């Protein structure tokens, strides 16, 4: 439940890559496999 | 599954006796195969055990917080003071025999999760039940007692096995099977069937 | 020198080495004619085709050339005598043996090679997941599609 | 590059040789260049090898290629298998893709 | 009282951040061989310091013990499974009528915690048991 | 739902006898005795005793599958010696020692204070 | 009902390469300088060491399922301490006026070099190895 | 949810030691570690049983009906 | 378009697929209470039986091998060699 | 696509799978309930009535029972409802839809099915509990593991159909696969890891066990083999008993690096008359390799004999291990104190090299190689420098590992693990990488806000110096995380893209087959190969042989 | 006396550390197991719930009841319901206890095993008595109630064994060691430097002589002497677990002997 409430989605150059700037803001690990991997993020 | 990306289904349950045992008389609630470790490099798992062991012993909450100065040594050092081999190994005896096990074993407590998705909730198994009205083909899902998908890919395999007959029997006698009458001049299903 | 060919001859030999208990101390009863002419004759009964005409009789020769090479280099006079002290009996057996095995290594009409191949390539392909060239899936894709815009072109001159 | 080579004494030895790898293609004009051994010049661009050396050669590279994809991964696959592919890709005298633009046009029945 | 600030990725561009305050603001005037190796506090520029690196994580990964002694992807897997775990999702599960609810008979707080589980209320509503495990080849089953 | 009742571990069902004695076919004076609703506890104990008899040429045992509680004891004895006897003896020698232990323990237990 | 080779050996080296119950022994032969020996021995059941006087014997006697005691009061080619059984595999021409052989005692190996053994040494499986004092 | 009657692992009755344990903590002002040992819980299979229990029932009882 | 028993070029040896269909088809007849041309050493399973009707070349079935042009060649299970 | 060439068929079943070491390679464990559902239309025949009637009496809810009884007219007598379900006198000609019984042939598959091996026929074995139970060495062809995979089962309905499965698609028949022209089923996990130990020269067994191990092998000739030792104690070696599993007539020579018909390292392999003479038994011998004891035993003794080889080897080795035990713990990842010293500094110099290159480069002294930016050359160096560093600290670690070290211990069997695993778990993890380059400057001229702009030093750009043991540092963590992700992502991609290719290939060749004139043509008849594989030889019946006439000096070819 | 011989060291209501010598390891074990799994005992194996206004589930509570230890000394004269010719149960094969608890006070009322109330006729045999070793005398904490919560049960305790279910085990935990110094070499210790400095030393060593440096390997010695200790849930006095253990095992053996006979 906590994890669902803290979720993030990104519709649609490289967007599923964990990105430098993400440090501090989005969890580096938590993310679904395949399908929407890297698109669905978790604060 | 542990807490380190290592899931597994039960494969059999053994009663206390058949289980390998500790000289202290302690026996495991669960046994995992050493082989699911070298490759997954999920070391923390191992560590956590070292820690959780010491902890349970000394009634101290084990602190496996990330970036800390907690060492596998400092811990092994603590566990020894507790009269146990500093790594988690402990001579163990084979339940059947009572003899000692030629190889000491990694024994300790480790937090394990009970994941949803339990066999009984999946065991579907049909043998010709209800079929779709539109295609006269078996229905989907097991809640409905449907059929399993013998899709494209499975077919190719059968073709590869050169098992012609089976194939026909799969794509016909089971699922779609229908008799149609045709005009010996215009191969169309335009022949009025008046059977009597 | 190591190429996949039907009939592991080396084995047949070993399987005579002890099926007839061959002693490396006494002399064989093999006639130079036996061996040489025998090996030769063996090469006549391998077959993969049976038309009685020129064309096909020539294909048949082609499809056996290599194996035969293997066969000749292995079943050579010295070898037979000096390398593995066979005897007219063992040797004679080894031959009758190869023939049969060969005949057993032929493909059976019906074998659906189309798929059998497609899959034999698709599978080990789905095992691929990773000195600056385009390889792996992408490239294989490049190929199968017969693309013209390949990313890593190159010309290798000597 | 490394190249095994028969030595006068019989055994294969290793006689390293200079080879130029290129980052761009134009086969048609490089063979003609002097000094190079036009007998061996090669390219991973089978299409080009096709247009220039004929299709029977193209088939070769086409395989030489596929092969490398599969073997660079340590994995092996019996010849025949890939052979069949390439050939099926090469019988119609040209380079027919495994795409729809190629084999579905093929001459086959409608249903396939 | 201005002892903290709220920084977004854009302003982050213009700042220098020390990880540990301590270990990064003492002057360099023997080292435990079992502790990991860290570089140095090379910067007469620090404008900020991290509240605590463990904070770069989020709910799910937060419950992993020592995820810093674990191969990258395995941490992501666990995070996806912690959501399929059983336990008491709410002390009032008995008064709620909802499509399926799975509750553990005897939930146990883990012997191995994270200084960040205190906020995720894990110890209070644990999901998992503390079983005595043995990594060993037994019946081959 | 596909789990067998626990009692099937120690209760013979229908058409199940505690023992079945079939003559081994490979060796002479050999016999494979199958035990029903019995596990390692007995199997291994009897296997061990059966190996004290010097007229015993062979003796092993196996629970072919954990799922089921049954096992097989194989016995080969010296010409003229019937393994069934070799089995009898063993069980006895076992009971005797057992009784013994029972006593000696009960003795000591009584000299104890607490 | 025979014996196939007798000879006292002097152990020159004893090597325990990452094994704790096995050592590969290499002892030379007293008498005929031509003869040398390479053997695998269970140092746990039969210790050995720097320069020992070892008596060796081969034979093929004192294949039906193995039995054990009783005969503890019967036959007894127990005039030795250590004994093994094995299967010999390859006979080799060390060339020159010398010839060698190879035996495998369930993995414990032995190579024997000499020449007059052309007769005294078997050509089949059977082959016991007896050692004493 | 209430103290497990008996230890999963070995079977040593444990459900009759929760209150005892708690008291040893609050009043006897002892550390979880010794409190355990005094209650006769010497092996870890039997120490995690109590040490880890999260007596949730005490929160389920606050629900009026 | 037929081909005399002579000029026969197809494999003398029976293909696995041919024998698996022969085996199936006879096994099926046997399962339908059809006469058995062999003596059962105590066999009961149709297939297992049919296997033994082949092992004793007593299966009155013939295989028609169509070539790719349209022609063919009729081989009898009595002729065909069963190595495999 | 989903209705004509791919349909939902009846008589299918699916559940979770788990390994079962006491099941034969070619069987499959079908949970009683599933067997009670799936049925098989068997016609009544004097060769069976007794069993058939007996089952019909057993009814649809006791295993060896049945459901439905079909008659002449085509009526269906439903055996679970029917005033006359306890009556019914079977009539020759009728049909008794019976439960699936033991030894039935069934098509068992795991998806995705990108093989023939993904679908194979297994002998049924009805058993308790509810998971399909399968032999481990059937694992790889289906590419399964037991972390939750589910598998599909289909039941032949026609007498022919069955035959087609038991004669063409049987697991036995598939051990030597035509694709890799080698076998496609080896020996894994415990059986492999163990068989090795059980083999060590240092490994001996005595009476009580020997007698059990022997008995354990079902095909035992009950003839106790004479001990390798008869001295102070009659001891057998590991090889000794294992050899019981290997049948007679199997021969196998090997020779690894230092082999020498006396293999001081218990190297290579030598098996004669089905008796293992020398060499430790591990992956190369028993793996699913080309030369393999399996490739040989299939070709020589027959598919079935070789099918059995598996269970036997397993039953024996498994038992032996069940009593020897085997495990792993952190301990197994700890390296010699002086070693970590030598390692930590091994890196210490790698860093100095990078640093010394860097300063060189910044002085513009560097000489740019041809075709590369002085910048490109710079990077490539450091990356090389760091890789070597990792690999040597790693090697450095691998040497400590005592033969008793379980990790190393599995690596030697070839049952899991490789240099890399050790190297990372024990010494330095390594240089992280995204898109083939070392971590980028997501921020302006820097990696994270914890570094100063322009900083190409290893720490800054993704070089995780620590080990999984020692633990990573935030930055290290984050970095290693980035790569981690790159992985998981192309993971999801490399799957679909390949899945697609797998099809285009399959459609493209679909209809190609070896016709009766040994030719290879597609539907049209258009010849594709005048002789299949150019030798009209079947891929499975092939093996790598050496053409003794190509190599060797001219003198040796003559000698 | 004859073979097998003991040497109790410790002893009390719950434990019995003792040395069992001159026996086969096979037996030491068979004994050990049997103790763990085949000694009979009385335990609730059926709960009839009348009212449960509690926070816990019926079967959840029922499960715990089953686990609550009950007296079992005279269990040898109580039958297995499956053998009693009664329909279901009776006072010849069972023991029925009642549990009734009402949340009276607004101060949480606890429900202990001491509240079970034998209703059936014990027939003068010591059997089925909530076993209590508490200090305060409140054997096991079954459940807790709120303001006005009810719990009205009726259990039927039956004879059973650890095999059908673990609730029926009287043993708890059994220590077991043999050859404290690895003289027998039945193990190969895992080390980093000195397997002797890294691996602890069992109390049991004190009761045995060291290995004597240069002494060869004793290749003929087998396992004699075992250092055990039986903990006891208490439904049975420790001495009994050991006896009844020995007994049971002995009967098991006898029944095979009796088998051949009827054969
Ligand atoms: Zn019409
Ligand atoms: Zn416990
Ligand atoms: Zn009654």
Swiss-Prot record, chain A:
It is found in: Nucleus. The chain holds residues 491 to 539 of 1224 of the full protein. This is DNA-directed RNA polymerase II subunit RPB2. The binding of ribonucleoside triphosphate to the RNA polymerase II transcribing complex probably involves a two-step mechanism. The initial binding seems to occur at the entry (E) site and involves a magnesium ion coordinated by three conserved aspartate residues of the two largest RNA Pol II subunits. Present with 18700 molecules/cell in log phase SD medium. Transmembrane segments: none annotated. It comes from the Eukaryota. Signal peptide: none annotated. Component of the RNA polymerase II (Pol II) complex consisting of 12 subunits. Belongs to the RNA polymerase beta chain family. DNA-dependent RNA polymerase catalyzes the transcription of DNA into RNA using the four ribonucleoside triphosphates as substrates. Second largest component of RNA polymerases II which synthesizes mRNA precursors and many functional non-coding RNAs. Proposed to contribute to the polymerase catalytic activity and forms the polymerase active center together with the largest subunit. Pol II is the central component of the basal RNA polymerase II transcription machinery. The gene is RPB2.
UniProtKB/Swiss-Prot annotation, chain H:
One of its GO terms (biological process) is RNA-templated transcription. It is found in: Nucleus, Nucleolus. GO terms for cellular component: nucleoplasm; nucleus; RNA polymerase I complex; RNA polymerase II, core complex; RNA polymerase III complex. Pfam families: RNA_pol_N. GO terms for molecular function: DNA binding; DNA-directed RNA polymerase activity; zinc ion binding. PANTHER family: DNA-DIRECTED RNA POLYMERASES I, II, AND III SUBUNIT RPABC5, DNA-DIRECTED RNA POLYMERASES I, II, AND III SUBUNIT RPABC5 FAMILY MEMBER. DNA-dependent RNA polymerases catalyze the transcription of DNA into RNA using the four ribonucleoside triphosphates as substrates. Common component of RNA polymerases I, II and III which synthesize ribosomal RNA precursors, mRNA precursors and many functional non-coding RNAs, and a small RNAs, such as 5S rRNA and tRNAs, respectively. Pol II is the central component of the basal RNA polymerase II transcription machinery. Pols are composed of mobile elements that move relative to each other. In Pol II, RBP10 is part of the core element with the central large cleft. Belongs to the archaeal Rpo10/eukaryotic RPB10 RNA polymerase subunit family. Present with 5300 molecules/cell in log phase SD medium. This is DNA-directed RNA polymerases I, II, and III subunit RPABC5. It comes from Saccharomyces cerevisiae (strain ATCC 204508 / S288c) (Baker's yeast).
Curated annotation (Swiss-Prot), chain J:
GO terms for cellular component: cytoplasmic stress granule; mitochondrion; nucleus; RNA polymerase II, core complex. Component of the RNA polymerase II (Pol II) complex consisting of 12 subunits. Interacts with DEF1; the interaction is direct and serves to bridge RPB1 to the Elongin complex in a DNA-damaged dependent manner. Interacts with the Elongin subunit ELA1. Interacts with the Elongin subunit ELC1. Interacts with ASK10. Interacts with ESS1. Interacts with RTT103. Interacts with SHE2. Mg(2+) 2 binds at residues 145, 147. Belongs to the RNA polymerase beta' chain family. It is found in: Nucleus. Mutagenesis experiments demonstrate that the minimum viable CTD contains eight consensus Y-S-P-T-S-P-[A-S-N-G] heptapeptide repeats. Identical and simultaneous substitutions in a number of consecutive repeats are lethal: 'Ser-2' -> 'Ala-2' (14 repeats), 'Ser-5' -> 'Ala-5' (15 repeats), '2-Ser-Pro-Thr-Ser-5'-> '2-Ala-Pro-Thr-Ala-5' (10 repeats), 'Ser-2'-> 'Glu-2' (15 repeats), 'Ser-5' -> 'Glu-5' (12 repeats), '2-Ser-Pro-3' -> '2-Pro-Ser-3' (15 repeats) and 'Tyr-1' -> 'Phe-1' (12 repeats). The keyword Transmembrane does not apply. This is DNA-directed RNA polymerase II subunit RPB1. One of its GO terms (biological process) is translesion synthesis. Its main location: nucleus. The C-terminal domain (CTD) serves as a platform for assembly of factors that regulate transcription initiation, elongation, termination and mRNA processing. There is a cross-link at residue 359 (Glycyl lysine isopeptide (Lys-Gly) (interchain with G-Cter in ubiquitin)).
Curated annotation (Swiss-Prot), chain K:
It comes from the Eukaryota. Disulfide bonds: none annotated. Transmembrane segments: none annotated. Its main location: nucleus. Keywords: Acetylation, DNA-directed RNA polymerase, Metal-binding, Nucleus, Transcription, Zinc. Component of the RNA polymerase II (Pol II) complex consisting of 12 subunits. Belongs to the archaeal Rpo3/eukaryotic RPB3 RNA polymerase subunit family. This is DNA-directed RNA polymerase II subunit RPB3. It comes from Saccharomyces cerevisiae (strain ATCC 204508 / S288c).
């Amino acid at each position: 439940t906590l994890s669902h409430l803290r979720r993030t989605n990104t519709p649609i150059a490289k967007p599923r890559q964990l990105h430098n700037t993400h440090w501090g803001l989005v969890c580096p690990a938590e993310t679904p496999e395949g399908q929407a991997c890297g698109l669905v993020k978790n604060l | 599954a542990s807490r380190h990306g290592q899931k597994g289904t039960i494969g059999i349950t053994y009663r206390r006796e058949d289980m390998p045992f500790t000289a202290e008389g302690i026996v495991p609630d669960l046994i995992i195969n050493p082989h699911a470790i070298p490759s997954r490099m999920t070391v923390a798992h191992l560590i956590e055990c070292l820690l959780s062991k010491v902890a349970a012993l000394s009634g101290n909450e084990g602190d496996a917080s990330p970036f800390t100065d907690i060492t596998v040594e400092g811990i092994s050092k603590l566990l020894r003071e507790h009269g146990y081999q500093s790594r988690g190994f402990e001579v163990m005896y084979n339940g059947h025999t009572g003899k000692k096990l030629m190889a000491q074993i990694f024994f300790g407590p480790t937090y394990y999760q009970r994941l949803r998705h339990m066999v009984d909730d999946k065991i579907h198994a049909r043998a010709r039940g209800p079929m779709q009205v539109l295609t006269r083909q078996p229905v989907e899902g097991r809640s409905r007692d449907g059929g399993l998908r013998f899709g494209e890919m499975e077919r190719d395999c059968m073709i590869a096995h050169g098992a012609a007959s089976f194939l026909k029997e799969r794509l016909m006698e089971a699922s779609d099977a229908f008799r149609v009458h045709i005009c010996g001049i215009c191969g169309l299903m335009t022949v009025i069937a008046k059977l009597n | 020198a190591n190429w996949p060919l039907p009939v592991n001859i080396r084995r047949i030999i070993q399987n005579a080495q002890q099926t007839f208990h061959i002693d490396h101390t006494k002399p064989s009863d093999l006639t130079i004619k036996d061996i040489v002419l025998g090996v030769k004759d063996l090469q006549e009964n391998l077959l993969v085709l049976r038309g009685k005409n020129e064309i096909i009789q020539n294909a048949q020769r082609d499809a056996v050339t290599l194996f035969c090479c293997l066969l000749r280099s292995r079943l050579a006079t010295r070898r037979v005598l000096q390398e593995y002290r066979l005897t007219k009996q063992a040797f004679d057996w080894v031959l009758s043996n190869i023939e049969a095995q060969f005949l057993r290594s032929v493909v059976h009409p019906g074998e659906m090679v189309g798929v059998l191949a497609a899959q034999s390539i698709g599978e080990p392909a789905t095992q691929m997941t990773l000195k600056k060239v385009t390889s792996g899936v992408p490239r294989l894709k490049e190929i199968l599609n017969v693309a013209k815009n390949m990313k890593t072109p190159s010309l290798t001159v000597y | 590059y490394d190249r095994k080579v028969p030595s006068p004494t019989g055994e294969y030895v290793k006689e390293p040789e200079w080879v130029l790898e290129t980052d761009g293609v134009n086969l048609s004009e490089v063979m003609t260049v002097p000094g190079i051994d036009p007998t061996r010049i090669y390219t991973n661009s089978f299409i080009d090898i096709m247009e220039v050396l004929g299709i029977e050669a193209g088939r070769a590279a086409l395989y030489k290629e596929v092969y490398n994809v599969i073997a660079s991964d340590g994995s092996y696959v019996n010849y025949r298998h890939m052979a069949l592919l390439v050939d099926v890709m090469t019988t119609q005298g040209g380079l027919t893709s495994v795409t729809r633009h190629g084999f579905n046009r093929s001459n086959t029945g409608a249903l396939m | 009282e201005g002892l903290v600030e709220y920084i977004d990725a854009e302003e982050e561009e213009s700042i220098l951040i020390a990880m540990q305050p301590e270990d990064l603001e003492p002057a360099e005037a023997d080292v435990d061989p079992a502790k990991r190796i860290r570089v140095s506090h090379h910067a007469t520029t620090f404008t900020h310091c991290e509240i605590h690196p463990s904070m770069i994580l989020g709910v799910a990964a937060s419950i992993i013990p020592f995820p810093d002694h674990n191969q990258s992807p395995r941490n992501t897997y666990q995070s996806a499974m912690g959501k399929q775990a059983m336990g008491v999702f709410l002390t009032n599960y008995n008064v709620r009528m909802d499509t399926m609810a799975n509750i553990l008979y005897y939930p146990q707080k883990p012997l191995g915690t994270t200084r960040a589980m205190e906020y995720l209320k894990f110890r209070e509503l644990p999901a998992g048991q503390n079983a005595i495990v043995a990594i060993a080849c037994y019946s081959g089953y | 739902m596909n789990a067998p009742d626990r009692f099937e571990l120690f209760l013979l069902g229908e058409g199940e006898s505690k023992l079945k004695i079939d003559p081994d076919t490979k060796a002479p004076n050999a016999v494979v005795i199958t035990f029903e609703k019995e596990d390692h506890t007995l199997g291994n104990l009897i296997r061990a005793e059966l190996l004290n008899d010097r007229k015993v040429l062979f003796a092993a045992y196996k629970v072919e599958h954990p799922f089921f509680a049954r096992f097989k004891l194989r016995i080969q004895t010296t010409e003229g010696y019937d393994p069934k006897d070799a089995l009898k003896n063993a069980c006895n020698s076992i009971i005797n020692k057992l009784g013994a232990l029972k006593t000696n323990f009960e003795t000591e237990w009584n000299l104890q204070t607490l | 009902s025979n014996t196939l080779f007798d000879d006292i050996f002097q152990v020159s080296e004893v090597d325990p390469g990452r094994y704790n119950k096995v050592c590969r022994i290499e002892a030379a032969s007293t008498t005929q300088d031509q003869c040398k020996l390479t053997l695998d021995i269970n140092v746990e059941l039969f210790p050995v060491a720097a320069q020992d006087s070892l008596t060796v014997t081969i034979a093929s006697s004192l294949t039906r399922s193995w039995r054990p005691p009783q005969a503890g009061d019967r036959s007894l080619a127990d005039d030795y301490d250590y004994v093994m059984y094995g299967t010999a595999y390859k006979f080799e021409e060390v060339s020159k006026d010398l010839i060698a052989v190879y035996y495998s005692f369930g993995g414990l190996l032995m190579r024997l070099e000499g020449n007059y053994r052309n007769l005294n040494n078997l050509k089949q499986e059977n082959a016991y190895l007896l050692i004493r004092r | 949810m209430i103290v497990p009657v008996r230890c999963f692992s070995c079977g040593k009755v444990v459900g009759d030691k929760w209150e005892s344990y708690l008291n040893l903590l609050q009043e006897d002002e002892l550390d979880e570690g010794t409190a355990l040992s005094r209650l006769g819980l010497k092996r870890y299979c039997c120490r995690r049983m109590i040490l880890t229990h999260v007596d949730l029932i005490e929160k389920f009882l606050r629900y009026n009906p | 378009k037929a081909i005399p028993k002579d000029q026969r070029a197809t494999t003398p040896y029976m293909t696995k697929y041919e024998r698996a269909r022969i085996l199936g088809t006879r096994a099926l007849q046997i399962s339908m209470n059809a006469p058995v041309f062999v003596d059962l050493e105590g066999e009961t399973d149709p297939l297992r039986i049919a296997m033994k009707e082949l092992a004793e070349k007593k299966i009155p079935l013939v295989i028609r091998r169509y070539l790719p042009d349209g022609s063919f060649e009729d081989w009898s299970v009595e002729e065909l060699i069963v190595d495999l | 696509r989903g209705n004509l060439m791919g349909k939902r068929v009846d008589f299918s079943a699916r559940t979770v799978i788990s390994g079962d070491p006491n099941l034969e390679l070619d069987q499959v464990g079908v949970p009683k309930s599933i067997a009670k559902t799936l049925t098989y239309p068997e016609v009544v025949t004097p060769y069976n009535i007794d069993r058939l009637t007996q089952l019909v009496r057993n009814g649809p809810n006791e295993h060896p029972g049945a459901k439905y009884v079909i008659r002449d007219s085509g009526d269906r007598i439903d055996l679970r409802y029917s005033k006359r379900a306890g009556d019914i006198q079977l009539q020759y000609g009728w049909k008794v839809e019976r439960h699936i019984m033991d030894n039935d042939p069934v098509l068992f598959n795991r998806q995705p099915s990108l093989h023939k091996m993904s679908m194979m026929a297994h002998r049924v074995k009805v058993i308790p509990y509810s998971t399909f139970r399968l032999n481990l060495s059937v694992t790889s062809p289906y590419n399964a593991d037991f972390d939750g995979d589910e598998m599909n089962l289909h039941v032949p309905q026609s007498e022919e159909t069955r035959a087609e499965l038991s004669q063409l698609c049987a697991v036995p028949l598939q051990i030597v696969s035509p694709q890799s022209n080698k076998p496609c089923m080896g020996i894994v996990q415990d059986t492999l890891c163990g068989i090795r130990k059980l083999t060590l020269r240092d490994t001996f067994i005595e009476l009580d066990q020997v007698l059990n191990m022997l008995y354990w092998v079902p095909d035992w000739d009950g003839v106790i083999p004479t001990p390798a030792i008869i001295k102070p104690k009659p001891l057998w070696s590991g090889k000794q008993i294992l050899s019981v599993a290997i049948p007679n007539g199997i021969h196998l020579q090997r020779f690894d690096e230092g082999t020498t018909l006396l293999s001081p390292k218990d190297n290579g392999m030598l098996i004669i008359d089905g008796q293992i003479i020398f060499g430790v038994v591990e992956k190369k011998t028993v793996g699913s390799s080309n030369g393999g004891l399996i490739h040989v035993v299939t070709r020589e003794k027959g598919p079935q004999v070789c099918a059995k080889l598996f269970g036997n080897i397993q039953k024996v080795v498994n038992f032996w291990l069940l009593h020897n035990g085997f495990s792993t713990g952190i301990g197994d990842t700890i390296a010699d104190g002086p070693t970590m010293r030598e390692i930590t500094e091994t890196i210490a110099e790698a860093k100095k090299k990078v640093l010394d290159v860097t300063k060189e480069a910044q002085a513009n002294l560097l000489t740019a190689k041809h075709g590369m930016t002085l910048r490109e050359s710079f990077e490539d160096n450091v990356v090389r420098f760091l890789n070597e560093a990792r690999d040597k600290a790693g090697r450095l670690a691998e040497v400590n590992l005592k033969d008793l070290n379980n990790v190393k211990q599995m690596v030697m069997a070839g049952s899991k693990g490789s240099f890399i695993n050790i190297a990372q778990m024990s010494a330095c993890v390594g240089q992280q990488s995204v898109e083939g380059k070392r971590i980028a400057f997501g921020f302006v001229d820097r990696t994270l806000p914890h570094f100063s702009k322009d900083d190409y030093s290893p720490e800054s750009k993704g070089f995780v110096e620590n080990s999984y043991l020692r633990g990573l540092t935030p930055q290290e963590f984050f970095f290693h995380a980035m790569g981690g992700r790159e992985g998981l992502i192309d993971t999801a991609v490399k799957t679909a893209e390949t899945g697609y290719i797998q099809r285009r290939l399959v459609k493209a060749l679909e209809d190609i087959m070896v016709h009766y004139d040994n030719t290879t043509r597609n539907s049209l008849g258009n010849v594709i190969q005048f002789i299949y594989g150019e030798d009209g030889m079947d891929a499975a019946h092939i093996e790598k042989q050496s053409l003794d006439t190509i190599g060797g000096s001219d003198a040796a070819f003559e000698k | 006396e004859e073979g097998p011989q003991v040497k109790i060291r410790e002893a009390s209501k719950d434990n019995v550390d003792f040395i069992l010598s001159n026996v086969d390891l096979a037996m030491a074990n068979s004994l050990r197991r049997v103790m763990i799994a085949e000694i009979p005992t009385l335990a609730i194996d059926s709960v009839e719930v009348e009212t449960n206004t509690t926070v816990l589930a019926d079967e959840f509570i029922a499960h715990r009841l089953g686990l609550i230890p009950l007296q079992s000394m005279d269990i040898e004269q109580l039958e297995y319901s499956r053998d009693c010719f009664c329909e279901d149960h009776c006072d010849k094969c069972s023991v029925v206890l009642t549990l009734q608890a009402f949340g009276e006070s607004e101060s949480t009322t606890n429900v202990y095993s001491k509240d079970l109330v034998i209703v059936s006729n014990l027939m003068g045999r010591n059997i089925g008595h909530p076993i209590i070793q508490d200090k305060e005398g409140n054997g096991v904490l079954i459940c807790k109630l709120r303001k006005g919560q009810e719990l009205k049960l009726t259990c039927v305790a039956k004879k059973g064994i650890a095999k059908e279910h673990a609730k029926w085990g009287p043993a708890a935990a059994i220590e077991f060691e043999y050859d404290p110094w690895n003289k027998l070499k039945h193990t190969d210790y895992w080390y980093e430097q000195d397997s002797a400095k890294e691996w602890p030393q069992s109390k049991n060593c004190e009761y045995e002589d060291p290995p004597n440096e240069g002494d060869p390997f004793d290749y003929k010695a087998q396992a004699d002497t075992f250092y055990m200790n039986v903990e006891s849930v208490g439904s049975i006095p420790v001495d009994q677990v050991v006896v009844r253990g020995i007994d049971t095992l002995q009967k098991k053996v006898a029944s095979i002997l009796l088998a051949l006979t009827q054969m």
